[PDB]
Amino acid sequence: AVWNYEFDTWSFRTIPYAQCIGLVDPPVLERGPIWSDFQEITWDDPSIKEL
Amino acid sequence: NLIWEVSNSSYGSITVDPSDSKLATLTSFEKEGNLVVTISTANESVVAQIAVNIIDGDSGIFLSQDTVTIRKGGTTTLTAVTGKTPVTWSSNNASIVSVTPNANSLTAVITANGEGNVTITADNGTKTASCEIVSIPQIDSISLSQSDVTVSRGSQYILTATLSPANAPNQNITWTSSNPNIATVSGTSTQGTINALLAGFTEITATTEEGNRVAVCTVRVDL
Amino acid sequence: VATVTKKASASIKIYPVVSQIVPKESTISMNFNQTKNLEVSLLPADANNTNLIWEVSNSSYGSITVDPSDSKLATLTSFEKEGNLVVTISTANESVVAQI
């Protein structure tokens, strides 16, 4: 049940079975990658498509 | 009451016998070295310590560390045991490794300058000790991330070289490749190999400025 | 978790550092005649646990201005010339440099 403390409104949503939660920086592939980093990656989405 | 214990109970046929009432006697043997005498109580957490040194004679001398392995730029210390305060040091091959006896003259600091075995020694006047030293480079080996790379016309793939130790002071790399007309690389662990032709194998080998000259080799494959 | 543990005894002795600091001089200054060689009398702070080194600037006021101190002190001489100079009684290596 999410509440916005800037406009005082209530809303709900679903989460993927969270035992915990926190904030952290993402992996290098999502922390800002570089063209000359995908030296081993190819267009055959080797287990990575959501980019 | 208390219980008298001694570490390395080999310095006498009967090092310390059971104290008659409170105290016991001490003996010795024909050998030197450092030991500790722990006067422990019955069971409570009370463990004292007494440091005794067998001088090996009247004014003999024996060093704590006999063999040492130091890396370039590092430093160590030495400890002696004598009866005479004057302790003059003397190291063969002086100008390969320096020494600086402290005020007490029973301790000296070592400073490695370059690779090379040294046999720093002291001289009390009657007896003499020795301390072998083997200077080792800051590095023992290296490794790369790829050995069978493959590129094309113009494409330049970047290679990385992770040194064996996590860190190395004053380290520097000068990449070399026979016949640099095919490609050129230099700088640091980051190589950035550039390709000029569409065929012709190459042998990208590292050349660590410091550390052991031992390097690796990689075989580029443009086809 | 540590299943087994073993201790090692090791004692250390740190000689006193008191009185090793800059010493004090009784004869802060001493004027003599042209070619007099009046001996010098002084003591550092308790003269304990360390030695010193007697140095003199412009070591040209005598064939042997100040010779190596026998045990703790040395002698002084003079030459047939005038001028101002300074006698630095420096310790072995510590940053202790006096002046006379």
Place this chain on the structure above:
Amino acid sequence: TPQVKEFESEYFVDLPGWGEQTVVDNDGNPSVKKFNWKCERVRSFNNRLF
């Protein structure tokens, strides 16, 4: 080092006392020594420096 520039000076110089730390030897004998202090930012406040 911060390398302050005095008001009555025409050249830059390291800060005075930067690295000074009081040490007391046996019997309570004080002394001062300078160590390699390196900072990232310095500002002024309440007639002080941070």
Place this chain on the structure above:
Amino acid sequence: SSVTLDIVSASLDVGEEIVITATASPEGEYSYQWSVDKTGYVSTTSVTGK
């Protein structure tokens, strides 16, 4: 097993350095943690090293 040290006493002066090495009877791999009875009077570096 039982541990021993070749060093048991030493004479130092303020400003002088010294290095001690720990060596157990067996050649196995173990962890080290140095301790001091009276705080101060010394400075340590890499207490987890032999």
